[PDB]
């Protein structure tokens, strides 16, 4: 019986309805659930660009296509001359050279306002930053690999030209005793950072010409999409280059020994590049770089888009300060040595509470000699926390000396100080100064003059105890201010910004060589401000909840930290590692009894790797979403069991004497929406798994009964046996020193995430049904247009295609034209089948429609190369094409489409061997699309080309 192409089974319609339903739920809850606060302040400037037009085709062939600019900021740069450290900004996928605007303008203003007067800073080798930016014509870099290589080659030549600029007296005004620059600092955005890494492997790279790469939201670990084979190969090249170079034991054999790479990720608000791909932990050792999120950068504390990471005001200031702390024009490479650069980057980008954080004060030179009476009024008893409700009660400079406990106790102990008042730098009279004091011997022990050491007379008694004291300002941790009028760690309005808190955290072994911690209260009149300092035991402050993921997802975890709690408490859940699961954190009300608390509770949700910390000021209700173990990225490196999973750091007022409750439960819809960044690229490949299994069932029934069933009927027959079985095979495949372990299927071998295979399968069933109905609608619509033209008329009245591809037409244009000719054949087939309604006309229509669906699901992979080619034609760039690859990638489709235009139906199918070859080919295509589809989506075109050649063979046999 004639079965309509539009008819669908109830079983296949319900399954497709769930697939579309689960797609909407994932998409909807990825834009509404667990969304981070937006806290970027817009930045304004006066932009200007000087085109370096002497950098032309004599220097590089690509200079007819690309351009180089020097940023000049109005009010600062009054001429196009280079007077400082050269910095190169690389824009990303379809980015603009005019995106350096914010960061280049802040660098121009900061040197004008502050540094150019700081005479010590210039004497230390600090000059202005010359920001060069490159115009790539908004190239689609993430979708074409030859574009990436061209950009890297152009930029190596551009660095040669930039460094040549500093030799010309007519263009460079610099001190005559300075060395000539031999390096450029590279700041790359998105694909821009990837080009920077590629720049170091290209043949025309000049050695030692890049030593500092800072990338903003760059996918270092993995290509964003794998539609081009050259992108995948270049990622393999650069990732292998970093891994091999840093795996060398002798630094002379390490080409990247002097290179530091810092990767900054926008976070959860970045929906263009997954922040999971920014992790360089599998590429760069901690001595040479790190991955940091903008939510952990002090005085930024916000997540950002892919675009806002450049113009955000807070982050702009932070990055310019970090860049100005590394430059050194006294060295030919215009930066400090590698270790000093790493220390500065850690200071400016990291929270300071990491394990890699370095403490300066404990072993630093003493900066102040303090005189205190022997009456021990200042010296307090051990085990008492120092609480200063107000500053300046007495009206004179005071010293509070806290004795450091002896290290005899086996338990680990920490000294923690929290204040909302800015701590004085050495040699500065402010409101408050904290310093580590060591007792000076009564006997005149031989020592230096202590000329930097200043005096502070506070005794006025015979004792006059002498103390040599080191200011702890170098090691101050800046914490967002958690007052009870604060909602976010940031403030979009600069006027409403609360001055942040100051935090000190020391292990007792670090400061055991000292005798006291001196909190010098310099205020005289009573001024607002609190200081809490105490020593705490690791047992009392740190809690670990060893609860499995199943129990955590079922019941959640609840803690009741006690009232005796130290000011700072940590709660670690080692089983919270996945980036795909989102939680909800609740902190109980601090019932401060009889008094208001000194500050509101502050929570730091953080991960050991990558450096991804999030702050919740006035914490009561926090959305806990983390960037942990992501699906397709290389596996995390070995770590201590004390740094695994998720930890919460809690600061509360300890004087309230009220216990606090911490609850953590799972957010099901937020967890569901976490899947969109991670699995959006599955849908260029994995729906071919469903289509190939449907075409397998259509050909099976045809070869056995002679009837080519509709795509919907084939889908209904496949959902009963074939598709469920092959999803079980995918699950079994997942369960069965390599950095490409997580590149196939779901990318997660973890058996917990096996439900993702049925989830993706059902969503792709729904998507295939919808695309089928779209193709049917398009066929009917074109047929209606043709019939309408016919009625308007009535009432009112070859073998050359091979030559085209070999010369100038890329096979993607030919493929699009083949798809259009196939649509025309489909329209004729449908019209004929409606006119005649023969069983032979239904077979041809169904067969042509299925082949059209197969072609249409490969078209997405080929379209990105078409736009690149059209763009290059617009710019007048011509790219030669290898005739062997173009011809062999398009002839099977050309021949199939021609055969269909002749109207010939596929011959029905030693004969059983030809019958089984079609089944085997379609099964292999389904399995290959499922397994290698995400990472090698460019090979699907070739595989489907092979299947089309097989169909042409079967057509030829009869």
């Amino acid at each position: 019986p004639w079965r309509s192409p539009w008819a669908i089974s109830v079983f296949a319609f319900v399954t497709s309805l769930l697939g579309i339903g689960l797609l909407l739920a994932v998409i909807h809850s990825s834009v509404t659930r667990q969304i981070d606060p937006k806290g970027c302040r817009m930045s304004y400037m006066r932009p200007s660009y000087a085109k370096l037009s002497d950098f032309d085709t004599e220097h590089t062939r690509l200079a007819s296509k690309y351009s180089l600019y020097l940023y000049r900021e109005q009010g600062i740069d009054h001429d196009v001359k280079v007077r400082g450290v050269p910095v190169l900004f690389i824009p990303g996928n379809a980015g603009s050279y005019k995106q350096v605007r914010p960061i280049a303008a802040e660098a121009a203003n900061y040197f004008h306002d502050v540094l150019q007067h700081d005479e010590a800073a210039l004497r230390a080798g600090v000059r202005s930053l010359d920001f060069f930016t490159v115009d790539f014509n908004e190239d689609i870099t993430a979708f074409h690999g030859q574009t990436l290589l061209d950009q890297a080659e152009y930029l190596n030549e551009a660095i040669r030209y930039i460094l040549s600029l500093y030799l010309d007296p007519r263009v460079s005004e610099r001190d005559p005793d300075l060395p000539d620059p031999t390096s450029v600092i590279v700041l790359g955005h998105s694909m821009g950072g990837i080009v920077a890494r590629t720049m170091l492997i290209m043949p025309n790279y000049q050695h030692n010409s890049i030593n500092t790469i800072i990338t903003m939201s760059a996918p270092h670990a993995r290509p964003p999409v794998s539609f081009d084979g050259q992108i995948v190969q270049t990622y393999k090249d650069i990732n292998n280059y970093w891994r091999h170079a840093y795996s060398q034991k002798w630094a002379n054999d390490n080409p990247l020994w002097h290179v530091t790479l810092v990767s900054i990720a926008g976070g959860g608000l970045d929906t263009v590049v997954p922040s999971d791909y920014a992790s360089i932990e599998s590429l760069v050792p901690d001595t040479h770089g790190f991955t940091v999120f903008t939510s952990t950068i002090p005085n930024v504390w916000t997540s950002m888009d892919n675009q806002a990471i450049l113009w955000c005001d807070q982050f702009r200031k932070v990055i310019i300060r970090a860049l100005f702390d590394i430059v050194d024009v006294h060295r030919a490479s215009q930066t400090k040595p590698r270790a000093q650069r790493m220390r500065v980057f850690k200071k400016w980008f990291l929270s300071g509470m990491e394990t890699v954080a370095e403490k300066i004060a404990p072993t630093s030179d003493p900066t102040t000699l303090l005189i205190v009476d022997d009456k021990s009024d200042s010296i307090t008893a051990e085990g008492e926390r120092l609480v200063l409700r107000e500053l300046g009660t007495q009206g004179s400079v005071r010293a509070h000396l806290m004795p450091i406990p002896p290290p005899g106790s086996p338990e680990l102990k920490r000294f923690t100080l929290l204040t909302d008042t800015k701590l004085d730098k050495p040699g500065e009279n402010g409101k408050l100064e904290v310093m580590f004091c060591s007792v000076i011997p009564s006997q005149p022990n031989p020592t230096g003059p202590a000329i930097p050491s200043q005096l502070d007379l506070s005794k006025g008694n015979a004792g006059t105890t002498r103390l040599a004291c080191t200011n702890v300002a170098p090691d101050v941790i800046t914490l967002p201010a958690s007052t009870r009028f604060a909602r976010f760690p940031f403030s979009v309005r600069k006027e409403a910004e609360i001055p942040p808190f100051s935090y000190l955290e020391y292990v007792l072994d670090d400061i055991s060589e000292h005798q006291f911690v001196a909190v010098i209260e310099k205020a005289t009149i009573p001024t607002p401000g609190f200081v809490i300092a105490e020593f705490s035991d690791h047992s009392n402050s740190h809690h670990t909840r060893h609860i499995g993921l199943r129990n955590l997802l079922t019941f959640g975890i609840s803690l009741r930290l006690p009232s005796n709690r130290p000011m700072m408490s940590e709660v670690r859940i080692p089983s919270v590692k996945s980036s795909l699961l989102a939680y909800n954190l609740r902190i109980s009300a601090l019932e401060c009894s009889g008094r208001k608390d000194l500050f509101a509770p502050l929570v730091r949700q953080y991960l050991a790797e990558p450096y991804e910390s999030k702050y919740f000021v006035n914490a009561r209700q926090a959305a806990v979403s983390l960037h942990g173990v992501a699906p397709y990225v290389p596996p995390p490196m070995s770590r201590e069991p004390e740094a695994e999973g998720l930890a919460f750091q809690l600061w509360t007022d300890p004087t309230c004497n009220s216990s606090i409750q911490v609850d953590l439960t799972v957010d099901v819809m937020g967890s569901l929406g976490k899947l969109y960044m991670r699995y959006r690229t599955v849908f260029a490949a994995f729906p071919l798994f469903i289509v190939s299994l449907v075409l397998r069932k259509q050909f099976q029934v045809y070869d056995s009964t002679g009837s080519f069933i509709t795509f919907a009927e084939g889908l209904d027959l496949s959902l009963r046996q074939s598709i469920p079985v092959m999803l079980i095979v995918l699950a079994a495949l997942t369960l069965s020193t390599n950095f490409h372990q997580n590149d196939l299927l779901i990318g997660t071998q973890d058996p917990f995430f096996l439900f993702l295979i049925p989830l993706i399968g059902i969503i792709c069933v729904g998507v295939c049904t919808v695309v089928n109905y779209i193709a049917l609608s398009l066929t009917r619509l074109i047929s209606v247009v043709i019939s309408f033209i016919g009625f308007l008329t009535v009432r009112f009245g070859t073998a050359v295609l091979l030559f085209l591809v070999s010369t100038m037409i890329p096979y993607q244009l030919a493929y699009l034209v083949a798809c259009l000719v196939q649509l025309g054949t489909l329209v004729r087939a449908q019209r004929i089948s409606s006119e005649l309604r023969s069983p032979a006309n239904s077979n041809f229509h169904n067969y042509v429609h299925s082949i059209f669906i197969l072609m249409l699901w490969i078209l997405p992979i080929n379209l990105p190369t078409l736009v690149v080619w059209m763009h290059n034609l617009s710019v007048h760039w011509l790219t030669p094409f290898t005739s062997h690859h173009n011809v062999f990638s398009i002839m099977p489709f050309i021949l199939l489409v021609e055969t269909h235009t002749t109207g010939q139906m596929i011959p029905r199918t030693c004969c059983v061997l030809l019958r089984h070859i079609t089944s085997i080919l379609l099964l292999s295509l389904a399995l290959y699309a499922a397994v290698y589809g995400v990472s090698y989506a460019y090979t699907l075109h070739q595989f489907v080309n092979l299947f089309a050649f097989w169909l042409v063979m079967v057509h030829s046999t009869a």
Binding site: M42, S43, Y44, M45, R46, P47, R101, A105, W311
Partner: peptide, 4 residues
């Protein structure tokens, strides 16, 4: 500024 003059531009954002």
């Amino acid at each position: 500024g003059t531009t954002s």
